[model samples]
Target: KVFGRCELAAAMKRHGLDNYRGYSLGNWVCAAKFESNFNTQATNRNTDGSTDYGILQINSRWWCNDGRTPGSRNLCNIPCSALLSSDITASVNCAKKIVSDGNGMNAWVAWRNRCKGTDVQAWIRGCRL
Candidate 1:
């Protein structure tokens, strides 16, 4: 894997995360597990009719901006790997910024509420990611 343990750790740190012990996989895994149980190939459309796709559940049409190809540059871009990276940390960091206005953990809290529930810790524990 291009993203091994160390690489993942480095990516997380680069995004200003303090620890990866409790919620090691961060918002990416947290959101993914709750949304589709880590199925990167998953795709769904929101009630508003926006297109959300893949592991990060990226709104490709909105975030990627291409609204046509699987690859485009927006908030996340496509080819999820490009956005999140194989490194869990990189993915986590990206996730954090998207949700929390570049605040990784706070962003995580916000996402948990939107995706699963307001009880962030409970939801995270339930997923077991």
Candidate 2:
């Protein structure tokens, strides 16, 4: 499921990502824009053999178990496949866990480089949420 810009904003808002963990709605929206371009089925293999999954590009090594990455922690306790669901509940929950970690939104370098501390209001400027 690939979400359009405002579509993703409303979805994230429903999941309470609007101000989750000190990051504004636009912060999450902006990160998702760069991480996977709102594509839920997106996956990328890291050189370390860890696969990043779903819209947030969550790492299999630390967040989900794809049954392939060595030393996978499965901190979210859900299958990596769950992140691909169009429902997006699991995706939002796992992203929440990543943010709650010591690294906060720093878990995603895309967030750090592109979204964090930027004026991200444009990410959700016209969204009805």
Candidate 3:
């Protein structure tokens, strides 16, 4: 596990991700909640045989090499296991790259399905950040 909503918001803000690529901290918080419950060690094996990893649930097919996935694009140039750590530097950096590539938060299925266009203020209700 990494952090609660307020702490996560402060961390994201310090990393310049509070509003990076026009996505709000609430968007990130809401997405993280649904994607991994803020647990960095979270992993999910999808029916399609691909695994989702870390707080962002980045896919093995494109973001990282999970070894099981052959010819992974590994656009983040990181091992999938790296994302499973409590330290979020690698995951956050990769996410920034992903958003810069024009996917934005839409890259996250959780964000697209649940967080997008929704009120996410409660995700950071009392952060004081």
Candidate 4:
């Protein structure tokens, strides 16, 4: 599923991403834009052989165990494939855990590069949340 900016904004907020870990909803939207272009099925392969999956691009090495990522901790305790769905439940839940256990939103390179310290309210202005 490919989501528009506003659509993904609402989804993220609805799933508890609004100001989650002190990161704004707009930051989440902006990161999603760069990470996966709002596509639920988006996936990427890392040089380390771990795969990044879903819109937030959760990594196989640290979050989900893909069975092919060499050695994964599976901190999120889920299959990497679970994040690649339109529902976003698994993605959102795992993201919250990552923020808490990892370095907040800084865990996502896209978020750090594109959203950190930026006034990104406009990213979700149309969503009106």
Q: Rate the local accuracy (lDDT) of all candidates.
A: 0.46, 0.93, 0.87, 0.90
For 1-129, candidate 2 gives per-residue lDDT tens digits of 999999999999999999898889999999999999999999999999999999999999989999999877999999999999898999999999889998889889899999887899989997797
Q: Note the clash tally of each candidate.
A: 0, 0, 0, 0
lDDT tens string, model 4, 1-129? 999898889889999899998888988899889999999999999999999999999999989988998757899999988999889999999999999975788899998988887888889885767
Give the winner by TM-score: 2
lDDT of 2 at 51: 97
lDDT of 1 by residue, 18-98 (tens): 334334434433455555445444566556655555445565544644255444356654444443333454344445546
Clashing residue pairs found in predicted model 3? none
Candidate 1: stretches off by over 4 Å:
1-28, 66-73, 77-93, 102-129
Q: In model 4, what lDDT does residue 102 have?
A: 54
lDDT of 4 at 97: 94
Model 2 misplaced stretches (Cα beyond 4 Å): none
Query: Which residue pairs overlap in candidate 4's backbone?
Result: none
Better of 2 and 3 by lDDT: 2
